C-alpha cells in the first residue's frame, strides 16, 4: 500500500513534468526574481500593453480593441492547456481503461478547474505571469478593462492569494490535479464506481504526500479539499461570462475545442 502510494505519487510527478512545460517551480522562481536571467516585461496600462504586445494569433490580428487581443491569447493558451491536461490525464493509472464517453466527460468538467488551479501558480497579490513567464500583467490593469471583464479576475486573485498561502509544490499539485479529474460526481457519467475506486487511491496518495512533504501544516489535506469546491464556484463564474459574450459581444467566436467543452453544462 504505502509504498505504491509513494510509487504512484512519483509517477504522477514524472508525467506532470512531462505534460506541463511551465511549472510552479519556474513560475515561482521568476516571480521572486531568482532568474534575473528571465526578467519579465511589465504591462500596467494601455500604453505598456502596446509595447509588450510586440513580444499564434496570426494575421487573425486586426488591431481591434484591447479586450479582443486579450480574448485571443486566452483562447490560444486555453487550447494548449486543454491538450497538456488531457495528455496528463491519459497517464493517471487506470484512466485509459475507462469507457471513452466517461473519459470525455471527466475532461469536459475537469478542465477549467485545473486551468484555474494552474493560474494561481502564476499569480500573486499584484498581477499575473503571462507569455510563458516573459510577461507580467498587473491586477490593476485587468481592472481597467471595460464591460463584463474589469471585475472578472478579482475573485481569482483572491483565492490565488488564499491558495498560494498553502505553499503547495509541483509534486503536491500533481496529485491534487489527478484527484480533481477522477471525480465521480460529474453530470452524465456512465460508470461512477470505477472512477471512485481510482479517486480513493489518489486521495490517499495525496494525504500521505502532504504529511510527508509538509509535516508542519497539520491539517493541509482538509484545507486543500475545500479549495476543490471554491474551484467549482470559480468555474460556474467562468461559465456565466462565456454566457454574456455568447449573446452580447459580437465578434468573439470560441475555439471549436472550447466550444465542445462549453456546451451542455
Amino acid at each position: 500500500e504505502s509504498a505504491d502510494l509513494r510509487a504512484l505519487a512519483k509517477h504522477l510527478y514524472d508525467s506532470y513534468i512531462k505534460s506541463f512545460p511551465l511549472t510552479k517551480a519556474k513560475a515561482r522562481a521568476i516571480l521572486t526574481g531568482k532568474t534575473t536571467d528571465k526578467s519579465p516585461f511589465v504591462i500596467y496600462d494601455m500604453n505598456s500593453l502596446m509595447m509588450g504586445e510586440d513580444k499564434i494569433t496570426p494575421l487573425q490580428e486586426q488591431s481591434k480593441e484591447v479586450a479582443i487581443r486579450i480574448f485571443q491569447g486566452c483562447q490560444f493558451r486555453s487550447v494548449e492547456a486543454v491538450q497538456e491536461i488531457t495528455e496528463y490525464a491519459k497517464s493517471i493509472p487506470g484512466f485509459v481503461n475507462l469507457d471513452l464517453n466517461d473519459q470525455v466527460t471527466l475532461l469536459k468538467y475537469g478542465v477549467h478547474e485545473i486551468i484555474y488551479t494552474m493560474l494561481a501558480s502564476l499569480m500573486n497579490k499584484d498581477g499575473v505571469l503571462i507569455s510563458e513567464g516573459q510577461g507580467f500583467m498587473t491586477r490593476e490593469f485587468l481592472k481597467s478593462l471595460r464591460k463584463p471583464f474589469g471585475d472578472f479576475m478579482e475573485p481569482k486573485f483572491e483565492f490565488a492569494v488564499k491558495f498560494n498561502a498553502l505553499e503547495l509544490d509541483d509534486s503536491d499539485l500533481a496529485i491534487f490535479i489527478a484527484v480533481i479529474i477522477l471525480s465521480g460526481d460529474r453530470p452524465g457519467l456512465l460508470n461512477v464506481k470505477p472512477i471512485e475506486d481510482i479517486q480513493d487511491n489518489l486521495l490517499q496518495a495525496l494525504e500521505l504526500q502532504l504529511k510527508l512533504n509538509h509535516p508542519e501544516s497539520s491539517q493541509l489535506f482538509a484545507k486543500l479539499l475545500q479549495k476543490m469546491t471554491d474551484l467549482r464556484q470559480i468555474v460556474t463564474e467562468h461559465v456565466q461570462l462565456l454566457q454574456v459574450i455568447k449573446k452580447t459581444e459580437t465578434d468573439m467566436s470560441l475555439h471549436p475545442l472550447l466550444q465542445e467543452i462549453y456546451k451542455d453544462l
Binding site: 486543454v82 488531457t86 495528455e87 471513452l100 473519459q103 470525455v104 475532461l107 469536459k108 471549436p256 465542445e260
Partner: peptide, 11 residues
C-alpha cells in the same frame, strides 16, 4: 463527441 477530445484521447 465531442470530436476534438476523442482524437486527443485516441492518441
Amino acid at each position: 463527441r465531442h470530436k476534438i477530445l476523442h482524437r486527443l484521447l485516441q492518441e
